[PDB]
């Protein structure tokens, strides 16, 4: 049995795929730091940190060490990664493992060295890096080996990466800093400006999942829920109701940037490849791809068919996993 692992180091979620086990770990990429006499110390990581925040006062502080598709905190990213790697270690398995890590396509040398070191520091022999859109496309089923063109749109928490693949290569790649976190920030700004109500991340993610949509009902308001927060002048808790119409209104800006990033990618793409993507469709992946109507909105504005992958939260990790299982393929990237 193997200790070989592939890591999908998301801004919102970290996934680890183990050779011969599939997905062994799926946890929020948060660290909880307690502040004490000027210092900050790592208290919990992952689902534990997210649990004990939400039971949160004064000390317990939240660091997302990857954020907006960049490494913000090198010290805490290292310890996050270490924790996760140690946590999936199997003692009845091969020595120090081979590791694959999925990095943003707009990742610099430095951030790559940083990833690679955090992994060696955690007990790996060798480390290979694979560009995210390439992993997303493989994970999703795309025929990235054919000379036919393929398009993948990966909507994360901090980033939306759009890429066109052909012939085992990336022909075009671009990332924009818009995804599920800007969606939440927009819903929370909307609650403040229109209904004068302060809300949190959790209430926000809940609205986005429950009535969020990239396109308003043709009706007028559609469905509604009630959400709790607190009045921003009075301090008292309050309930307000909100429609799918309001949510659509709230999300239109970040949705529109996503749509614009797809149009821009098409305008850069070679016509013959563009016509291939026209036949098979644009493939959406990543958790942001689960927003209602988002595929329907990209279809209207581009003219192209659009499909959401199966298990879009897991694509990058499955694609990384596929490379891990294929020794000759993993070869290709350790030579990176
Ligand atoms: N039903 C849903 N509708 C809309 N958004 C959702 C839904 N479920 C999850 N999400 C969002 O999906 C995002 C996380 O997706 P994910 O693909 O895990 O991100 P990531 O890989 O960690 N970020 P990144 O490094 O930018 O690629 C969060 O912003 C969630 O709010
Ligand atoms: Mg991602």
């Amino acid at each position: 049995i193997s200790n070989d692992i592939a890591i999908d180091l998301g801004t919102a979620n970290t996934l680890i795929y183990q050779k011969g086990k599939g997905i062994v770990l799926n946890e929020p990429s948060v660290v909880a730091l307690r502040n004490v006499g000027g210092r900050k110390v790592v208290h919990a990581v992952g689902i534990e940190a997210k649990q004990m925040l939400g039971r949160t006062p004064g000390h317990m502080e939240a660091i997302r060490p990857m954020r907006d598709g960049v490494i913000a905190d090198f010290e805490v990213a290292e310890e996050m990664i270490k924790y996760f790697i140690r946590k999936v270690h199997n003692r009845k398995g091969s020595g120090n493992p081979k590791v694959i890590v999925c990095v943003p396509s707009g990742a610099t040398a430095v951030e790559r060295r940083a990833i690679n070191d955090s992994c060696l520091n955690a007990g790996a022999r060798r480390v290979g890096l694979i560009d995210e859109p390439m992993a997303a496309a493989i994970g999703a089923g795309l025929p990235i080996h054919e000379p036919t063109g393929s398009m993948v749109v990966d909507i994360g928490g901090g980033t939306t990466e759009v890429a066109v693949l052909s012939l085992s290569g990336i022909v075009y790649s671009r990332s924009v800093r818009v995804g599920g976190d800007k969606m939440d920030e927009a819903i929370i700004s909307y609650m403040r400006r229109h209904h004068n109500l302060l809300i949190g991340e959790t209430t926000a993610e809940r609205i986005k999942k429950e009535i969020g949509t990239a396109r308003a009902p043709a009706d007028g308001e559609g469905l509604s829920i009630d959400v709790k927060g607190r009045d921003l002048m009075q301090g008292v808790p309050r309930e307000v109701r909100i429609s799918e119409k309001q949510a659509a209104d709230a999300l239109a800006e970040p949705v529109g940037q996503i749509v614009e990033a797809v149009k821009v990618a098409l305008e850069a793409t070679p016509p013959e490849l563009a016509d291939d993507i026209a036949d098979k469709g644009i493939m959406l992946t990543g958790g942001g791809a689960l927003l209602r109507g988002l595929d329907a909105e990209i279809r209207d504005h581009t003219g192209l068919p659009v499909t959401v992958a199966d298990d879009p939260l897991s694509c990058v990790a499955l694609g990384c996993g596929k490379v891990l299982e294929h020794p000759k393929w993993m070869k290709g990237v350790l030579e990176s």
Side-chain angles (χ1 to χ4, degrees), residues 234-307:
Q234 285 189 5
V236 332
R238 206 200 330 154
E239 207 146 301
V240 324
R241 239 202 194 186
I242 54 166
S243 70
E244 292 174 313
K245 199 280 165 85
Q246 297 170 35
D249 285 337
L251 300 157
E253 301 118 0
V255 170
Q257 308 183 251
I258 289 161
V259 169
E260 193 57 72
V262 182
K263 294 201 224 192
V264 184
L266 294 160
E267 293 176 17
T269 298
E272 300 68 34
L273 308 179
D275 292 310
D276 303 344
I277 292 149
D279 179 14
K280 346 198 292 299
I282 299 177
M283 189 60 72
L284 304 191
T285 63
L290 292 177
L291 184 72
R292 306 192 188 86
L294 180 56
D295 53 348
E297 185 76 352
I298 292 172
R299 189 219 309 132
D300 291 0
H301 287 75
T302 57
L304 292 201
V306 176
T307 332

Side-chain angles (χ1 to χ4, degrees), residues 120-333:
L120 294 169
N121 198 318
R125 20 188 152 259
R126 304 154 266 185
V127 177
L129 304 168
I130 168 183
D131 299 316
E132 314 192 303
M134 178 62 72
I138 294 160
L142 294 180
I144 58 105
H145 299 305
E146 304 173 355
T148 274
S150 287
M151 181 176 273
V152 71
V153 180
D154 187 310
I155 307 122
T159 59
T160 279
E161 268 241 41
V162 181
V164 173
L165 302 118
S166 162
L167 234 157
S168 300
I170 273 168
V171 170
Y172 175 97
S173 164
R174 187 172 170 253
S175 163
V176 52
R177 302 163 135 234
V178 59
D181 301 329
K182 295 278 249 286
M183 287 181 204
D184 310 340
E185 290 172 16
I187 286 165
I188 293 171
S189 169
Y190 181 98
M191 286 306 303
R192 180 172 73 257
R193 302 181 20 75
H194 286 55
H195 300 223
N196 190 321
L197 185 86
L198 203 101
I199 56 164
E201 259 305 313
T202 297
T203 314
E205 256 188 310
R206 155 172 162 186
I207 290 161
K208 179 181 65 183
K209 295 180 178 196
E210 202 126 6
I211 61 149
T213 183
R215 55 178 10 200
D219 159 28
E221 292 247 269
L223 301 176
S224 51
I225 54 163
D226 283 68
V227 357
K228 193 176 95 172
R230 88 163 138 116
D231 194 81
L232 137 178
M233 293 194 317
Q234 285 189 5
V236 332
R238 206 200 330 154
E239 207 146 301
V240 324
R241 239 202 194 186
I242 54 166
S243 70
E244 292 174 313
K245 199 280 165 85
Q246 297 170 35
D249 285 337
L251 300 157
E253 301 118 0
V255 170
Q257 308 183 251
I258 289 161
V259 169
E260 193 57 72
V262 182
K263 294 201 224 192
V264 184
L266 294 160
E267 293 176 17
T269 298
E272 300 68 34
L273 308 179
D275 292 310
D276 303 344
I277 292 149
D279 179 14
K280 346 198 292 299
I282 299 177
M283 189 60 72
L284 304 191
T285 63
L290 292 177
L291 184 72
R292 306 192 188 86
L294 180 56
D295 53 348
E297 185 76 352
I298 292 172
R299 189 219 309 132
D300 291 0
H301 287 75
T302 57
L304 292 201
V306 176
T307 332
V308 182
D310 305 301
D311 225 316
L313 285 155
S314 293
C315 281
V316 156
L318 303 165
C320 277
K322 239 220 171 155
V323 181
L324 193 68
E325 302 280 3
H326 293 219
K328 292 228 224 121
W329 223 156
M330 194 191 186
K331 204 52 167 259
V333 320

